[PDB]
Structures are given as C-alpha cells and as structure tokens.
Amino acid sequence: LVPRGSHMASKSFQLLEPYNIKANLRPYQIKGFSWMRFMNKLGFGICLADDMGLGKTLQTIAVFSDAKKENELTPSLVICPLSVLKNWEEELSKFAPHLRFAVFHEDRSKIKLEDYDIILTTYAVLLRDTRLKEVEWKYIVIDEAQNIKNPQTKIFKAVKELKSKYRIALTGTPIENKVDDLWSIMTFLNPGLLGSYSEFKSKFATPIKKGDNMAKEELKAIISPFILRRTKYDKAIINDLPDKIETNVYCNLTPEQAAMYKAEVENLFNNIDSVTGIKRKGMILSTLLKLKQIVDHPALLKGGEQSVRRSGKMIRTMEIIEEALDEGDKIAIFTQFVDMGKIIRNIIEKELNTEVPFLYGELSKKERDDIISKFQNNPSVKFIVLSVKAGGFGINLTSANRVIHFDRWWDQATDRVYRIGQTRNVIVHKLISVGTLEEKIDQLLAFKRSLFKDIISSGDSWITELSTEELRKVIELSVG
Ligand SMILES: [Hg+2]
Ligand SMILES: [Hg+2]
Ligand SMILES: [Hg+2]
Numbered sequence: 106l107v108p109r110g111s112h113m114a115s116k117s118f119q120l121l122e123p124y125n126i127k128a129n130l131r132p133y134q135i136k137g138f139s140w141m142r143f144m145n146k147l148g149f150g151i152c153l154a155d156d157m158g159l160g161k162t163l164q165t166i167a168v169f170s171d172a173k174k175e176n177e178l179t180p181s182l183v184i185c186p187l188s189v190l191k192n193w194e195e196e197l198s199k200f201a202p203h204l205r206f207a208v209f210h211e212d213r214s215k216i217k218l219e220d221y222d223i224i225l226t227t228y229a230v231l232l233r234d235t236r237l238k239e240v241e242w243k244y245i246v247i248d249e250a251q252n253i254k255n256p257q258t259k260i261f262k263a264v265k266e267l268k269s270k271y272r273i274a275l276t277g278t279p280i281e282n283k284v285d286d287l288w289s290i291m292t293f294l295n296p297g298l299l300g301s302y303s304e305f306k307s308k309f310a311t312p313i314k315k316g317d318n319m320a321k322e323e324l325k326a327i328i329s330p331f332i333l334r335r336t337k338y339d340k341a342i343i344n345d346l347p348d349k350i351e352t353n354v355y356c357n358l359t360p361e362q363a364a365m366y367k368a369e370v371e372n373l374f375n376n377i378d379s380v381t382g383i384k385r386k387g388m389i390l391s392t393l394l395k396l397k398q399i400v401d402h403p404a405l406l407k408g409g410e411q412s413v414r415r416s417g418k419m420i421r422t423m424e425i426i427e428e429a430l431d432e433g434d435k436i437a438i439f440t441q442f443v444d445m446g447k448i449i450r451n452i453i454e455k456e457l458n459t460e461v462p463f464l465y466g467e468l469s470k471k472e473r474d475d476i477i478s479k480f481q482n483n484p485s486v487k488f489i490v491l492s493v494k495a496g497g498f499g500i501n502l503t504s505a506n507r508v509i510h511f512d513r514w515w516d517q518a519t520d521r522v523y524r525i526g527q528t529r530n531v532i533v534h535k536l537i538s539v540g541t542l543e544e545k546i547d548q549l550l551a552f553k554r555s556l557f558k559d560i561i562s563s564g565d566s567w568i569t570e571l572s573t574e575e576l577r578k579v580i581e582l583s584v585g
Pocket of ligand 3: 358400416537538539
C-alpha cells in the first residue's frame with residue numbers, strides 16, 4: 106500500500122509545541138504541524154495530503170494557533186466545501202476556542218473580515234465576489250477535502266489571485282491522475298514554480314500519463330519539498346494511532362429531501378395534539394423512521410430514481426468512499442434499512458465497476474458466510490454493505506480499514522461482535538445530516554448522558570418520550 110510523501114526533517118527542526126490547543130497531537134501531527142509552519146515562515150506554500158482521518162485540520166488548527174502567538178494569523182482565510190464547513194467550526198470552537206472565526210456565505214453584508222482571525226468559505230462563494238480580494242490575508246488554506254473530484258477551473262484563477270502571506274492545501278492522495286491538478290495546486294502554493302499550464306501538461310502530463318517514469322520522477326523531485334503526506338498504513342504511524350478513530354461526516358440535504366423533511370415534520374404535529382398514549386410512541390417512532398429514510402434517500406419513499414444526486418448522504422458517502430479507495434482501504438457501510446442498502450450497493454457497484462457484497466438478515470448462513478468470506482479474504486473486494494438488526498449473527502469484519510455509519514448509530518459490544526478494529530486499526534465515519542434530528546440528538550446526548558448512558562436504551566426508543574416542546578426542537582428541520 107505504498108503512498109507516502111517525504112520531505113526530510115525528522116531528526117531536528119522546530120518541533121513546535123502546540124499553543125492553546127485542547128488535544129494531544131500524536132507525534133506525527135506535531136511534526137507536520139511544525140513542518141508547515143516552517144515552510145510558511147520561509148515563504149513557501151505546501152500541500153498536506155495525509156490519509157483522510159489523521160486530522161489534517163487539527164494540524165492546520167495548530168499551524169493557525171502558533172501563527173496567533175506570533176501575530177501572523179489575523180486575518181487568515183479557509184476555503185472549504187460546504188460539507189466540511191461544519192467539521193471546521195466544530196474544531197476551531199473546540200480545540201482553539203481562543204480563535205475568532207466566522208462563516209462567509211452569500212452576499213457581502215456585514216464585513217469585519219480584518220477584525221476576524223479566520224473566516225470560512227466555499228469555492229463558489231468566491232467565484233462571485235470582490236469583497237475578499239481587497240483583504241490582505243496572512244494565511245489562505247484551500248481545503249480540497251475528498252470533495253467530488255473536479256477541483257480546478259476558473260476557481261483557482263480566483264484564489265490564485267488573492268493576497269496571502271502563507272499558503273496551505275489539504276488534499277487526498279497525489280494520484281498519478283491528479284497530475285493536471287498538481288500544476289494547479291503547486292502553482293497556487295508556489296506560483297511560477299511550474300511555469301504555465303500549457304507548458305506543464307506538454308512536458309509533464311502528456312508524457313507521464315503516456316508512461317514516462319522520467320518526467321515523472323523529475324516532477325516528483327521538483328515538488329517533493331512542498332508536499333507532506335502520511336499514510337494510515339505507515340508502520341511509523343500505525344503505532345501513534347488509536348484502535349479506532351471517530352469522525353463526523355456532515356452532508357447537506359438536497360432541496361427535495363429538505364422539502365420532504367419539513368413536510369413529514371408538520372404531518373406528525375398537525376396530527377399529534379389529538380392522539381396520545383402508546384398511540385403516540387408508535388406515531389412518533391413512525392415519523393422518525395421516515396425522516397431517517399428521507400435523509401438516506403427519498404427514493405425510499407417517493408420511490409423513483411435511485412441516484413446519487415437525490416441524496417446528500419449518498420453524495421458525501423460517494424466522496425468519502427472514493428478517497429478511502431484511493432488510500433487503498435477496504436470499506437464497510439452499515440445501514441439501518443435493507444432497501445437503502447440495495448441502493449447503496451447499486452450506486453457503488455455501478456459507479457465504480459466493482460463488487461459490493463451485500464449482507465442482510467434474511468439470508469442463509471451459507472450466504473452470510475460466503476459474502477463475509479468474500480469480503481475478508483478477497484483483496485479485490487473493497488466494499489461491503491450490511492443491513493443487519495440482530496446483535497450479530499456471525500459478522501467477521503476484521504479486514505475493514507474503514508467503516509461508515511450511513512445511519513445514525515445511537516455499541517462496543519456490537520463492534521466487538523462484528524470484530525471491527527480487532528486486528529487492524531480502523532477509521533469510523535458517522536454520517537450526519539446538518540439541521541436534522543441526526544444533528545440535534547447528537548447534541549442533546551453529549552449534553553450529559555450521566556442520566557442517559559446508564560439509564561435509557563437505544564436511540565430510536567426514547568426519542569419518543571420527548572414532550573412536544575423539545576420534540577419540535579430536536580426533529581424540527583433547522584436551516585437558517
Ligand atoms: Hg498535492
Ligand atoms: Hg466552507
Ligand atoms: Hg444528508
């Protein structure tokens with residue numbers, strides 16, 4: 106699983122000490138954190154391509170904080186895809202609270218950019234503006250997260266036309282395909298370095314892709330000092346990492362889904378005041394189980410076209426699913442509903458020409474076996490979707506490097522049974538749908554749970570004991 110990018114420095118250099126940062130950055134992070142800072146002060150821009158799940162953002166936060174204790178942060182810009190925008194806020198506010206940030210959506214409006222340490226924004230939110238160009242930002246981070254695939258375009262011309270003093274770029278894996286993107290990013294980070302696009306492709310792209318281990322090695326050589334990339338499989342790193350890393354993957358609902366949600370929300374209320382008793386615990390639990398399906402995929406209700414475009418989960422899943430693939434992982438996707446499972450299998454199975462053994466309850470032991478066997482042994486099989494309700498018939502998922510909870514998991518006994526993260530470290534993803542019971546319940550639980558952990562049981566159940574006042578708080582869609 107070779108895919109590690111070097112940049113000499115692991116013997117000395119300024120192993121900076123994270124500043125006001127609530128966390129114990131594994132050694133490999135304190136380094137990256139520092140290396141970036143180093144190259145930044147030196148005046149070079151760099152790309153951090155560590156496998157998704159090793160927290161390039163935390164390191165980037167540190168890079169941000171250490172540039173605070175030096176009067177080189179206020180103001181900095183971070184251009185991330187809507188999706189990750191939550192992850193960012195999630196982490197600044199938490200890890201580096203002492204750092205002022207603010208999202209920058211549509212129209213100009215109230216500007217205090219210069220007064221804010223960092224400001225968040227989307228590529229699009231750039232493509233149509235001016236407000237920012239005026240600003241002279243210290244840092245300018247381009248977070249090309251696992252976002253779809255086409256990142257380049259007139260967008261870079263916009264970015265690559267701003268005013269920074271420091272430049273970082275968080276990305277997936279320098280895939281030999283990314284070549285043409287490599288020019289765009291390297292340029293952004295270090296302008297001129299590669300010349301012109303025309304020039305680039307001409308002597309690098311067309312040849313390398315056309316099989317030229319010559320210009321290939323060369324290009325690698327020339328950029329080597331500006332790209333740092335650690336691998337979840339790097340022996341040196343397998344160690345510093347926990348058995349399981351937990352990440353929250355956010356997704357935003359399509360306007361269809363959004364509609365179906367608000368609707369299906371009003372329909373439980375405009376028909377609840379009346380009913381009551383266990384004829385409310387059944388009614389509520391019914392709505393919930395529809396909202397959950399809406400977010401998963403509306404084709405689950407309106408029937409119809411089972412496409413990626415109709416589901417925000419599916420879109421995000423697809424991105425995440427894809428980077429993990431490039432990082433050479435083996436993914437396991439779990440879904441509450443059997444049909445969402447088939448949809449997932451289909452979409453993936455089709456869109457990537459590859460088998461996606463699907464495992465669900467009703468299925469002879471032989472199959473569950475042959476399927477899980479197919480996923481375990483066969484290195485060709487890289488996915489497995491599972492829709493199981495039982496405690497754990499007989500699921501052996503030790504081969505999984507990554508796991509996605511398509512449906513909100515509301516467990517250790519479960520992970521143990523399925524053998525997740527037993528004989529390999531494993532990264533686990535929880536899909537969250539912004540402005541949804543999926544998000545709010547995620548909130549109320551971490552509230553205390555000193556009354557919810559020992560007492561109350563599984564997620565679905567109790568959500569119904571909620572008295573209208575808060576039920577209308579938790580489930581009510583929330584988009585400002
Ligand atoms: Hg790169
Ligand atoms: Hg963003
Ligand atoms: Hg979603």
